[PDB]
Write a protein that binds this DNA or RNA. Structure first.
Length: 578
DNA sequence: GCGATCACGT
DNA sequence: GACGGACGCA
């Protein structure tokens, strides 16, 4: 493009409206370099070196002025990288990444060029073509870098209006401006704050694990003949199914299955199997959680700073990476103790955790208007026990533990939209038997059945389904003549208004909570979101206020035909917040 | 640099 | 045949 390579900041660069590019090339933008800045506004196109621009008091003033509106792509990346430099970014009124995510989350828009292609704009290169792939990644020389950054800013400048126009046609403009963009700032603060980690406690757990892995690893070698890579399903498969001749219950595309569900059925045949299961559990904790956390914890602050991917999933859920903090173990006690290493950032603070109880089935009761399901939540029943009572036609005192377990698994399948092979699998029954359970469910909950039928028809007719706050998911596969592919699209038509509305609700709750915390002059702060749960830390003197405030704000985020209900706990570590 | 397999929470 | 971090091979 035609643009100015500026040696200093000028007044015409600080207009009331601009496309702004604050380029961070490193994937993890925490404390990462800013390699260049581009500004496009009514007066022209400008490239600035960050050493110049970020030391200029008027430019910094302009970045922080809420009344100076900026249009950007992935403003959270820029906001966080600037936070690490002590600079506040305000006034971002349009985020092209989030706009493209809302318009079609299946596109996988991850740079300006991919978003621009959605509106037939191609005068910008993909970041990968400019910087390189993995190891071959590099920042090019200034003339090349400056043209790329100005071309990205020019693209944002030209694309704001067509994206906003389509968002408005879809009734998603408020979803962008009042939900996703405010949430992006809250996520930035959460990531920047980080979670404090007790690294010595993690190290001693790693030491304990490494000893136990060593003991089980040698026991496996004695029970087998040879030594082998227990972590490679191929070598393990030769040992189990050829050397020891265990029955082959399930094959994979490349060989025999050694999944935990197959190994458990093989346990009676040979002592080695239980040890492989034990090794898999321990190795999971060591490699994924202990080693992963120690690798990414910042050694100066002893904090981990995750990155929440706000623009990735087709349901509207967040994801979390580097480290992923949304799948820290909790089901088994050995892994749950890892949560003891997540601690408040200040002495005499505590961890506070609040979770919605059954938000997805409450959402389902609301959208389906199912009388039976609505009444169960209005009575605040144990929904798994109640589902077992209806599915199996027994009174509450005849629900056995196994009945409740199988009803909970049906509830899981309904809440996530898993296939009948999925449900049969984790219930260890036949696909046919799993389908009969679903059948008995629809008979006890005929409103849910009507809703499933109607929403599949709606998806076929409109081409998409929507959530309570107008998030959209397109389902072109709903007319596929491949039965599996079509069934998958049908389940996604059912599931997305459920899981996606629950995502809408907690995102609004986060916005409301952040505003309420400031109103009430609390020091408490949000640290993590885990799909239906919010994790905070606060001075211990604030716990009593948070016990009243947090559940109320989360419960009042939307109004449904059934109440929402939030449980909460607090303690000295994340583990204790139970 | 990839594709494949397994496993964690919600 | 829901979704979203970590051998094999190359």
């Amino acid at each position: 493009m035609a643009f100015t390579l500026a040696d200093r900041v000028t007044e015409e660069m600080l207009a009331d409206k601009a496309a702004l590019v604050v380029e961070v090339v490193e994937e993890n933008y925490h404390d990462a370099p800013i390699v260049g800045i581009a500004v496009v506004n009514e007066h022209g196109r400008f490239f600035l070196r960050p050493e110049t621009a970020l030391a200029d008091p008027q430019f910094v003033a302009w970045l922080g002025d809420e009344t100076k509106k900026k249009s950007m792509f992935d403003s959270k990346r820029a906001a966080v990288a600037l936070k690490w430099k002590g600079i506040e970014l305000c006034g971002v009124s349009f985020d092209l990444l989030l706009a493209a995510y809302l318009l079609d989350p299946a596109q996988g828009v991850d740079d300006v060029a991919a978003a621009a292609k959605m509106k037939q704009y191609e005068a910008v290169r993909p970041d990968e073509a400019v910087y390189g792939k993995g190891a071959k990644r590099a920042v090019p020389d200034e003339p090349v870098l400056a043209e790329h950054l100005v071309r990205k800013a020019a693209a944002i400048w030209a694309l704001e209006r067509p994206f906003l126009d389509e968002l408005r046609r879809n009734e998603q403009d408020r979803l962008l401006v009042e939900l996703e963009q405010p949430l992006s700032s809250i996520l930035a603060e959460m990531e920047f704050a980080g979670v404090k980690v007790d690294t010595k406690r993690l190290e001693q757990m790693g030491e304990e694990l490494a000893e136990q892995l060593r003991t089980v690893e040698q026991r496996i070698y004695e029970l087998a003949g040879q030594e082998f890579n227990i972590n490679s399903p191929k070598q393990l498969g030769v040992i189990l199914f050829e050397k020891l001749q265990l029955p082959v219950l399930k094959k994979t595309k490349t060989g025999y299955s050694t999944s935990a569900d197959v190994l458990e059925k093989l346990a009676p045949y040979h002592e080695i199997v239980e040890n492989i299961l034990h090794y898999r559990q321990l190795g999971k904790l060591q490699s994924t959680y202990i080693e992963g956390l120690l690798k990414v914890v910042r050694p100066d602050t002893k904090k981990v700073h995750t990155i929440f991917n706000q623009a990735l999933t087709q349901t509207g859920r967040l994801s979390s990476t580097e480290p992923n903090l949304q799948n820290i173990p909790i089901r088994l006690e050995e892994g749950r103790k890892i949560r003891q290493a997540f601690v408040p950032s200040e002495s005499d603070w505590l961890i506070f955790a609040a979770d919605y109880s059954q938000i997805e089935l409450r959402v389902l009761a609301h959208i389906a208007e199912d009388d039976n399901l609505m009444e169960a939540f209005r009575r605040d029943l144990d929904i798994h026990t109640k589902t077992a009572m209806d599915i199996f036609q027994v009174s509450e005192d005849e629900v056995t533990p196994n009945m409740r377990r199988q009803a909970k698994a049906v509830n899981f399948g309904i809440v996530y939209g898993i296939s009948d092979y999925g449900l049969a699998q984790n219930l260890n029954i036949s696909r046919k038997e799993a389908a009969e359970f679903i059948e008995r469910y629809f008979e006890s909950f005929p409103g849910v059945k009507r809703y499933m039928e109607n929403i599949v028809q709606e998806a076929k007719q409109k081409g998409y389904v929507t959530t309570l706050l107008h998030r959209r998911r397109y389902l072109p596969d709903i007319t596929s003549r491949n039965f599996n592919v079509r069934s998958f699209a049908e389940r996604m038509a059912m599931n997305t208004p459920i899981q996606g509305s629950a995502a809408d609700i907690i995102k609004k709750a986060m916005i409301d909570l952040n505003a309420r915390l400031k109103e009430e002059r609390l020091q408490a702060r949000l640290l993590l979101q885990v799909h239906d749960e919010l994790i905070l830390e606060a001075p211990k003197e604030e716990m009593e206020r948070l016990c009243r405030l947090v559940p109320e704000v989360m419960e009042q985020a939307v109004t449904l035909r059934v109440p929402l209900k939030v449980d909460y706990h607090y303690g000295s570590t994340w583990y204790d917040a139970k």
